[PDB]
Ligand binder design. Sequence first.
Ligand code: YFR
Length: 182
Amino acid sequence: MGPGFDFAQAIMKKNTVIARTEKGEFTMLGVYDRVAVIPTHASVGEIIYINDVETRVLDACALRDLTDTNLEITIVKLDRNQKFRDIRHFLPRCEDDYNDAVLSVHTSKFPNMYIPVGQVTNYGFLNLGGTPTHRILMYNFPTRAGQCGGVVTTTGKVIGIHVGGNGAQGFAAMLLHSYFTD
Ligand SMILES: CC1(C)OC(=O)c2cc(Br)c(O)cc2O1
């Protein structure tokens, strides 16, 4: 409908796949080469389904900060025959607050879904499902089961992936450029 939705659509149309694990179907953001991200609660194994194709997992790393605190981001390298468009230059370098964000989801349950969530707070610490978690972003939208892995964008920046909610607020794990240096 406007330039926020334009940037979100550009990311969804080229840089997402549908990931299926034993714990469900997730929006999965591809970042560069065969490297993608997914919430750590997806419990990625040795094999994952990518757009309903059986795919070997070459590497999976559940990220923690240097306090050894959960970040809820797993970086996955996929044995796929095709590379993602490199979007690392759209990742923030530092922790920050944002205005006017969009949460975008693409699954069998929620195809082509875009939500204007408004202001995003650098919330920091969250007890997420009983697990102490750092680098959480918060938005005041009643997000629901099925939106985990959804991409959080502003115009020109990919800032997080949706990892939970409490019925009134939604919570995303930050994406930082430093997670994807090589
Ligand atoms: C009520 C409650 C906790 O129920 C869910 O199952 C749920 C899942 C996601 Br994902 C979310 O953003 C928010 C949610 O709200």
